Design a protein around this ligand. Structure first.
Ligand code: HEC
Ligand code: HEC
Ligand code: HEC
Ligand code: HEC
Ligand SMILES: [Zn+2]
Ligand SMILES: [Zn+2]
Ligand SMILES: [Zn+2]
Length: 91
């Protein structure tokens, strides 16, 4: 049993949880503002998240309409050094 991350959110909050009047914005800014309003800012999150504050929006990693709940983003589309989440979060 699988659910897209967008549907997981919309089942509780509507499409409007992320989209003004349920309609996407051209630049993703309204959506990013909504993610941060609920979840906090990148700068307030863990070591995978913090360094992306000022360079990415959430959706650059969490493709909410194409990823299921539980799926973890990986790093290779922007980093060519083979890094992993664990290499930043495990000591
Ligand atoms: C936040 C968790 C979201 C919810 C809930 C819904 N959508 Fe969304 N949508 C979201 C983002 C961050 C983006 C842009 C980046 C991306 O991943 O695509 C979108 C994009 C759309 C689009 C444009 C087409 C596309 O790029 O996929 C549409 C038409 C759209 N979203 C519609 C939509 C509907 C109808 C929703 C409720 C059922 C819905 N979205 C929920 C973020 C989120
Ligand atoms: C509030 C109205 C929210 C907005 C806007 C967005 N999210 Fe969210 N998210 C919300 C809740 C209440 C939860 C459940 C928390 C939990 O215990 O899981 C979530 C969950 C997620 C998750 C993880 C889901 C899981 O794997 O368990 C992700 C990755 C996530 N949210 C991302 C996300 C993004 C990218 C958003 C904007 C595009 C976003 N969320 C909006 C509440 C709300
Ligand atoms: C890639 C560079 C990311 C960006 C930008 C954001 N997220 Fe993320 N997120 C990413 C990974 C690889 C993971 C799994 C490993 C980890 O560090 O936990 C996550 C995880 C989450 C979670 C779940 C946290 C948990 O349950 O332990 C949530 C709720 C989440 N991410 C939300 C979120 C939001 C709201 C973002 C923008 C503000 C965001 N993420 C950016 C990768 C990346
Ligand atoms: C693009 C969409 C990215 C994805 C996917 C991931 N990262 Fe990233 N990261 C990105 C940028 C634009 C930057 C700043 C410029 C640069 O590449 O240096 C970063 C930076 C980091 C850093 C700071 C250290 C450094 O690389 O200089 C860390 C620790 C980091 N990123 C970790 C990381 C991880 C673990 C990812 C996958 C889970 C990941 N990034 C994905 C853009 C993007
Ligand atoms: Zn959860
Ligand atoms: Zn770098
Ligand atoms: Zn490199």
């Amino acid at each position: 049993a699988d659910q897209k991350l967008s549907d997981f959110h919309a089942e509780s909050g509507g499409c409007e949880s992320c989209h003004k009047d349920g309609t996407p914005s051209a630049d993703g800014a309204f959506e990013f503002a909504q993610c941060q309003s609920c979840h906090g800012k990148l700068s307030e999150m863990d070591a995978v998240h913090k360094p992306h504050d000022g360079n990415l929006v959430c959706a650059d990693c969490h493709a909410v309409h194409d990823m299921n709940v539980g799926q973890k983003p990986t790093c290779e589309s922007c980093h060519d050094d083979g890094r992993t989440s664990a290499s930043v979060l495990k000591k």
